[PDB]
Every structure is written in structure tokens, then in C-alpha cells.
């Protein structure tokens, strides 16, 4: 399961954060700062994979804002990248031409979409249209 998923910008500002592991707030902040420093101090040919604290810290940002994942050492690495790409595509479809400005404005919607997509670090919606339809139906409820 994915221990934590956090959307951080290139300048260091974090646009998303979802940790599936219960940690102290100071410890969580320190871990996030260390992850940002490692990502901010990494090149473009580092393979986007880091084994930090025995955790598969996978970083792959498709724009200025980067994305990170932390899975245990028990599964394949390309699966995390595929899941990240699928989540990005689903978010773009739900929003429509997603940019950094809209991500901050749609933080609650982004959190709801992440909850409806992955729960507890495990994959919850394998299809891409069923999750979008469910999100639209939930939004239309009011």
C-alpha cells in the first residue's frame, strides 16, 4: 500500500498531501520537509525512484508541481507510475485542462477524488470512467 502521497510544487509549496500511515504531526512535517529537500535536490536523470527509509519514494512531476509516492518494498515500481498517470488523467478529465491555479482552488474536490480513487494506500477504482461517473454523481447530490 502507498504510505503517503503528496503533491508538491517546484518551489517547495505543497499542493496535496494524503498519508496512510499514522505519524506524529512534527514527525510528519519533518518527513515531508526531507522528501521535498530530496526531490528538490534531485536531477532529471535520477530515474524518479528513491529508497528513502526503506520506502520506494517515487517522484514523477508532469509539470512544475511534482508528485510523490511512498510504497513498501513488496510490489513492482512501474505500477506506482501507472497509478499516478491514471490518477492524473482522471483528475484532468474531472476538471478539464488542470493547471496549478485550479489545483489550489479545487483542493476539496481533489481530496474527494483521491478518496474515491485510492483508500488506505490501495487501489480502489481500476476503471477510469466508473470513478469519474461516481464523482460526478456525488457532486450532483449537493
Amino acid at each position: 500500500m502507498i504510505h503517503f502521497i503528496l503533491l508538491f510544487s517546484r518551489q517547495g509549496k505543497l499542493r496535496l498531501q494524503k498519508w496512510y500511515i499514522t505519524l506524529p504531526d512534527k514527525e510528519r512535517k519533518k518527513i515531508t520537509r526531507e522528501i521535498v529537500q530530496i526531490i528538490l535536490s534531485r536531477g532529471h536523470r535520477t530515474s524518479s525512484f528513491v529508497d528513502w527509509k526503506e520506502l520506494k519514494l517515487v517522484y514523477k512531476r508532469y509539470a512544475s508541481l511534482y508528485f510523490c509516492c511512498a510504497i513498501e518494498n513488496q510490489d513492482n515500481e512501474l505500477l506506482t507510475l501507472e497509478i499516478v498517470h491514471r490518477y492524473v488523467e482522471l483528475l484532468d478529465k474531472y476538471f478539464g485542462n488542470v493547471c496549478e491555479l485550479d489545483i489550489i482552488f479545487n483542493f476539496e474536490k481533489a481530496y474527494f477524488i483521491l478518496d474515491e480513487f485510492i483508500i488506505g494506500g490501495e487501489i480502489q477504482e481500476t476503471s477510469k470512467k466508473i470513478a469519474v461517473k461516481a464523482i460526478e454523481d456525488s457532486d450532483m447530490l449537493q
Binding site: Y62, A63, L65, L91, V98, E100
Partner: peptide
């Protein structure tokens, strides 16, 4: 800026 750009450009 660099923030209004699409995440995937699709």
C-alpha cells in the same frame, strides 16, 4: 508563471 500550464497538456 508556469502554473496555468496543463499538467499533461491533453
Amino acid at each position: 508563471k508556469g502554473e496555468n500550464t496543463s499538467l499533461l497538456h491533453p
